[PDB]
A paper describes a structure:
The Scribble (Scrib) protein is a conserved cell polarity regulator with anti-tumorigenic properties. Scribble is an important regulator of cell polarity and acts as a scaffolding protein to mediate a diverse set of cellular signalling pathways via its four PDZ domains. The zoonotic Tick-born encephalitis virus TBEV encodes for the NS5 protein, which has been shown to interact with Scribble in a PDZ domain dependent manner.
To understand the interactions of SCRIB PDZ domain interactions with NS5 PBM sequences in more detail we determined crystal structures of SCRIB PDZ3:NS5_CTN complexes as well as a structure of SCRIB PDZ3 apo. Isothermal titration calorimetry revealed that only the C-terminal PBM NS5_CTN bound to SCRIB PDZ3 with a KD value of 18.4 ± 1.3 µM. In the Scrib PDZ3:NS5_CTN complex, His1071PDZ3 contacts Ser3412NS5 in the −2 position in the canonical manner observed in many other PDZ domain complex structures. Our crystal structure of SCRIB PDZ3 bound to PBM sequences revealed an interaction with a conserved His residue. Mutation of SCRIB PDZ3 H1071 to Ala ablates binding, whereas mutation of SCRIB PDZ3 K1040, which is not involved in NS5 engagement, did not significantly impact binding affinity. This supports the notion that SCRIB PDZ3 H1071 plays an important role in the NS5 CTN engagement.
Author numbering:
A (entry chain A): 723 to 814
B (entry chain C): 310 to 314
Amino acid sequence: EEEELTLTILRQTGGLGISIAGGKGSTPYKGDDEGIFISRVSEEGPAARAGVRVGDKLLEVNGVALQGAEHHEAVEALRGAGTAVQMRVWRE
Amino acid sequence: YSTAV
């Protein structure tokens, strides 16, 4: 079971309702992948309603790939991604 | 580590 999903998180203000872990140069979410992963989804928050799932690997934010991104770079991308944030994710 | 966004 491997799939790629395009999820659109909608917000008026505030956060997306997720936590991300990992990134280049940080402790990985899993030993075999240094990338950005969803470590927590807020109960029935924006991301939850958009269909995000813990363990999802975040490939892109509004068309900008996070391959090779440091943890802070992914954080900045999600914070400044706007009110409609489309995420290409990898789910197993 | 995690960052809430």
